[PDB]
Scaffold this active site. Sequence first.
Site, short mmCIF file in Angstrom:
data_model
loop_
_atom_site.label_atom_id
_atom_site.label_comp_id
_atom_site.label_asym_id
_atom_site.label_seq_id
_atom_site.Cartn_x
_atom_site.Cartn_y
_atom_site.Cartn_z
N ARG D 25 0.87 -1.69 0.05
CA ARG D 25 0.09 -0.18 -0.22
C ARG D 25 0.96 1.44 0.12
NH1 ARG D 25 -4.67 0.68 4.41
NH2 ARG D 25 -5.76 -1.25 3.23
N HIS D 71 -8.08 -3.56 -8.52
CA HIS D 71 -7.84 -2.06 -7.03
C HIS D 71 -9.16 -1.75 -6.52
CE1 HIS D 71 -5.33 -0.31 -4.74
NE2 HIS D 71 -6.02 0.91 -4.39
N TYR D 115 -16.01 15.60 -15.14
CA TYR D 115 -15.48 16.95 -16.04
C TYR D 115 -14.05 16.97 -16.46
CZ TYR D 115 -18.68 19.36 -12.38
OH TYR D 115 -19.99 19.93 -11.74
#
Lengths: 245, 247, 487, 487
Positions: D25, D71, D115
């Site tokens: 991680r 993931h 966006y």
Amino acid sequence: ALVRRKGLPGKLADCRSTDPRKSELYVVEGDSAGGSAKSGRDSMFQAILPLRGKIINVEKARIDRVLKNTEVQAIITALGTGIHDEFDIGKLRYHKIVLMADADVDGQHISTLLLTLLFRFMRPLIENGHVFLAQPPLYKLKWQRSDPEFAYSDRERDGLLEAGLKAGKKINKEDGIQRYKGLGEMDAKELWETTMDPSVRVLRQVTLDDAAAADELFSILMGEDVDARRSFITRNAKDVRFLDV
Amino acid sequence: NALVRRKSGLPGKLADCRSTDPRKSELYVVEGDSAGGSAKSGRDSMFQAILPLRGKIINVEKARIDRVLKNTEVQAIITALGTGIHDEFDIGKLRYHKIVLMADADVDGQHISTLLLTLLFRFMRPLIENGHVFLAQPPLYKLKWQRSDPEFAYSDRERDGLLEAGLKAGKKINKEDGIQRYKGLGEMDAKELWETTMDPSVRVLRQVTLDDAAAADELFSILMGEDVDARRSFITRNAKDVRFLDV
Amino acid sequence: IEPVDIEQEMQRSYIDYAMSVIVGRALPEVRDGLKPVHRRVLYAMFDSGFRPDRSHAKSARSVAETMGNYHPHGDASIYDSLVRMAQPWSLRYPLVDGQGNFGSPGNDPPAAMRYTEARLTPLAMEMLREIDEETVDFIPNYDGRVQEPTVLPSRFPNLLANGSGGIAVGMATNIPPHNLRELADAVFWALENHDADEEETLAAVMGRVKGPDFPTAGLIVGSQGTADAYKTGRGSIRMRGVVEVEEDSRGRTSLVITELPYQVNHDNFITSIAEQVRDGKLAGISNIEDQSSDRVGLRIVIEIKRDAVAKVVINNLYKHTQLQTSFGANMLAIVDGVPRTLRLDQLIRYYVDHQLDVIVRRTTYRLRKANERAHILRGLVKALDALDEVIALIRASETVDIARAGLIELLDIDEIQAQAILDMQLRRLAALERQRIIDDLAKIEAEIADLEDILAKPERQRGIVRDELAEIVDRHGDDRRTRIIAI
Amino acid sequence: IEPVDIEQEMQRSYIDYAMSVIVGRALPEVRDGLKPVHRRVLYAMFDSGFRPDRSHAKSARSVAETMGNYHPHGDASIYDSLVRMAQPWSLRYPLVDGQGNFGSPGNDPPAAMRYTEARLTPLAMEMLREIDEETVDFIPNYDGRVQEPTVLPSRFPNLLANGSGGIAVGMATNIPPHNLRELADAVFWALENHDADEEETLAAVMGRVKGPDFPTAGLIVGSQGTADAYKTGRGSIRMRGVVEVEEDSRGRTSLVITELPYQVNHDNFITSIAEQVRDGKLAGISNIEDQSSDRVGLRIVIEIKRDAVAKVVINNLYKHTQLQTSFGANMLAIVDGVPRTLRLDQLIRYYVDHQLDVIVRRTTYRLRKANERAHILRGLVKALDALDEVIALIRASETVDIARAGLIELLDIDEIQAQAILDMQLRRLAALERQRIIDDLAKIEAEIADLEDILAKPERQRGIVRDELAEIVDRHGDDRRTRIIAI
DNA sequence: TCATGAATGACTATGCACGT
DNA sequence: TCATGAATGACTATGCACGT
Ligand SMILES: C[C@H]1COc2c(N3CCN(C)CC3)c(F)cc3c(=O)c(C(=O)O)cn1c23
Ligand SMILES: C[C@H]1COc2c(N3CCN(C)CC3)c(F)cc3c(=O)c(C(=O)O)cn1c23
Ligand SMILES: [Mg+2]
Ligand SMILES: [Mg+2]
Ligand SMILES: [Mg+2]
Ligand SMILES: [Mg+2]
């Protein structure tokens, strides 16, 4: 006997039974899991308290800051008991406190944080065996014709698969074996038939043997001293597999 | 006349300008946090301030006044403009002599424009009468030539025109990257917004004019009022001919 | 700086918003009963292969695929729309197969995008059946990169089946769901009596569609409101939940509510009773307990006082709670790009028209494709009859262009056909393989004749719609849930 | 119910968490300098074809593909990770080409997922170069549905180039970014002096890698901290922004800050100065004005009082603000699944080792494929030499299997080769095409010879890494940004 | 005044190590 | 105490039409 909400946490989905001796509190990781758990539970005896985010480490955090944490307040308030010197087991609102987290590592971490809260603030709950750990499923075997089976380990999966094939049952190689990556991926029914149905659920009762040894371990793992924790991990991680051999 | 700008009693969302002269200052009222974010970056912080609006503005024509004044977005607009509302309106306290409404080219941008114009016409009408209200026309296309500077187009026609001209001129475009189509202000970066809607030397502004006040009062009440039937019949009557208003 | 008048701006802008919302957001297309977001989600899932013949894909992939190619809006609200299509208490016939926490009929919200998986349902697969055979018009998406369907084949009457509710501008729609089997009977009649006028058609269809069929079961009281909706396009349908009076060992009575009318929130319902008993409005009630579970379904127990009559308390509940509530039917749908309030005969007829269009277009596509294959097959057969010459020709050719051009002259063949000969594998030169080409030509020519026959006879076209729909209903049709009673 | 002791539970659970965070991680793999989320995002984008040769895909599609296949975590934090990899002030060499609002060095947050669009950068394409040629080990994903790479080819030293910062358990890493051209020189030396011991290698590499090169430019003051980091794996590197004193006609003098040290928030910096003046801890300052823009970059003008010395105020800024701030280097990375603090010579060497492994594996894969290609081509050539027989044989066969079996007998052929002849199109029987098959065999046998040579000679293997990397650096290498000065 | 549902996201709190 | 950066989503407010 005690009143249930129908002055407690807003997140709490309380039970209906007014007898703490018969009541159970499922402390659940995540709103999703908590949401479906609220649906799959037995509303008579089982209450749900969903926890959001990583719990604050009471070993590291100052006392006043811990008491400002909304999640800790929810736990303390829902359990009804006080903390530290003001602890009164007589006011325990649930005689079964089940921690239910994901099988993943973050679930394990959250478990250590909750156990730390309990051991430091409300130790008698552990000593008197009111704290339990729910073991979630890892796999769901979806047979073509037969009822689906749940497995709590890779070994059990391989076994139930082997047995079923030997028995003449069959599985799709597409749908096949569903693998759970967390409680949030389960629906209400699945949670009931694996973690909440008292006739099939796999609970582990947390016992406290040596308090002094526990006190030391909690301080090493959860304390502010990094070096102590770093060396402890490098020392004992090598042999974590063989703790139960 | 000069007034203090915020720098470390005005809306938190407001990214104020530096110039203390309203005559030279401009307020860009922007649709969306994203567009407002890029505007805050691409602006000229000297004269241009940014007030991002979040979500559809409350219809002051339908809602009672007390509810309107409790709306956080309306409060932000009124506070940022500095002027009062209705009878307590004082144009002397106007903090920006240019109030640019900048919304998406899509239909929801048009809707937000009508809601803002309704707020202005009903609460702060003199801002419209004195030509302090403007409408920014966002780009629709960005032509990305292989070797030449990119060109922006504000309509399908201009796209076709600039495309034809460039190709005729010997320029070339990828048929992959090619012509980027903007579906909203939020899809633009800081530079793009500057070079199309905020740079005063190239921006396409429309100044809102008010001719017949009585006629405006009627149209606002029909379109924005509580009367559905009136609104329904007006749309069915006039939507058929919306294309031909400027022919 | 250009000047613009506020009246021009206001009128132009609001009309543009109103019209797009009306036609392209809030209201269902009459032919498939879908709003743009629904259609785009389903097609995105379909094109991605997220079908029942494969495991559930992560729902984020459906949202993202919808966002990136078809629906230029937010991931949040798109997920909400996908979630709705998967809830059995929302859709009478779910179009999305959801895996995980998709919420409840109460205030329990659905799990976030990350937690859930999703795929199309078998019935949704009928919405999209043969969409790739030019059965519907396609148009470029919001940036022209790809094509999207203007409408779905919709091989079952989805608008009437799943209903639709939407708030537009100047108008709104509220079509209730219906029982698929009853709708099919209406369609079957419409197909048989294709010449019947509106007056007769309405009478026939109203006899077969007994009324709305809600996913939440419950009761429909009266027949006027239902009749009004089907004849006017407007009607008020009185709904009721189901109550069963239970007696106790002590002799106390309690009311058990196991069903509620359509679109009544379970938690709001319980809270409303609780609030109406604390202020003093529903006396006779002694205790309210929600004994519901995932295993017994809805079960709200209302213990009443000894000096209380069961029906009196039940009537009070009908009066002061949504245990009895009305469905405001307003049959509004987009027809040919225009919003229109429709009679039941019109809704059926317009759907049947869509089905015939689909079947004819499918037949046309299959006929065109069949001719292309036959054309190429004919070319291959010509090569086989003069195979010795064909091979010698290709070998003696310095290039493939020389070989191709030669083949046209040699066998009097098209360039497309000649290209097929060139692309031919040595595999197909085997004895049995030469034979399959012959038989395939014979096979296809029979198929072409069949297809031509279908296009020439409207009777067969209607027969296909009937038989294919019948197959769908036999497989996916279910019992009525909402019980219809008289006053 | 089974009993479990709290000490057993705590130790097992926390160690499991600590180890996964450490290895899987928070900390970078030494070979490609990536954490699992980085690697999975990039590979997801790669596999989806979101490459520089095509337009930016909506970033949601990258998130969803990463989330759905590799993931198993949330869309929010994955988007954050993708965004950071696209910011030029975060990564010295961005791996993601972002289109839209990706935030700023200040408190301006990035736009939401909806966006923005995104694709891989050319350099990221070098991270993934030839990953499909068995250059890295693959393992099953989180549900065994698909395979994912354990590490990327990483054809440029990404760990040192882009640096890495991560908080794990019991430890943390903080590797600064470096100038690619300088890193290449170090790699080039490591390849030439492949036998050199650690002492020599460290001296050589430290001479070529002059120090960190931050994307935010700025200054490095001193050389001790840099030396400590490369020699110890830990060191404190003092950074400074750039200040330019300007004088105004009549007016007072002002300090213009145009650059800041790595990872200093522009807005927090301005706020810190402002708050330390109000209370009064930075006297001499008269006014603070942010004249920054998208066109002039960072430009913070600090007008100072007339009875104030500029150099005094600048030192005060160095002391009491992050205009001067230290980078706490801790060169920690995962090596063979183990966290390790590394010297600069170890970091280079380990990377070079990885490159050689990649090149050898690529060569092995290409050699295997070349042999397969050649093997089939040999069959084709045999067919061409006896072309008349090949056709006649296939004709008389009742099946293709009889035709196949005969070909084996005719030409002494494998089952694979005979099948290839069978799959051959009449297209390739033209003169130039027959010749093309011959020449193709000749080409491959030449390629096979080259490949075999590479595997036998470590010299060539090192040469390949050198030349290929050199090509990458010539194309994607840039000037140094952070200026290194003495005390 | 509340529900409907398809449109227009920032803010909120922790674990973890390390340096100010 | 604060920043770093990957990990563990619910709540908040409007438009719009319609019926209790
Ligand atoms: C774990 C879920 C739910 O709880 C979260 C937060 N709360 C924690 C304690 N609450 C009292 C108030 C705030 C939060 F502030 C942020 C996030 C977040 O960013 C997030 C994500 O995926 O990016 C996911 N979650 C968050
Ligand atoms: C338009 C953006 C930003 O503003 C929004 C809200 N604000 C409304 C007024 N503000 C004072 C504070 C909250 C809101 F409550 C919800 C949403 C929302 O659900 C959403 C979506 O995509 O689903 C997108 N947005 C929302
Ligand atoms: Mg988890
Ligand atoms: Mg928009
Ligand atoms: Mg929303
Ligand atoms: Mg987050």
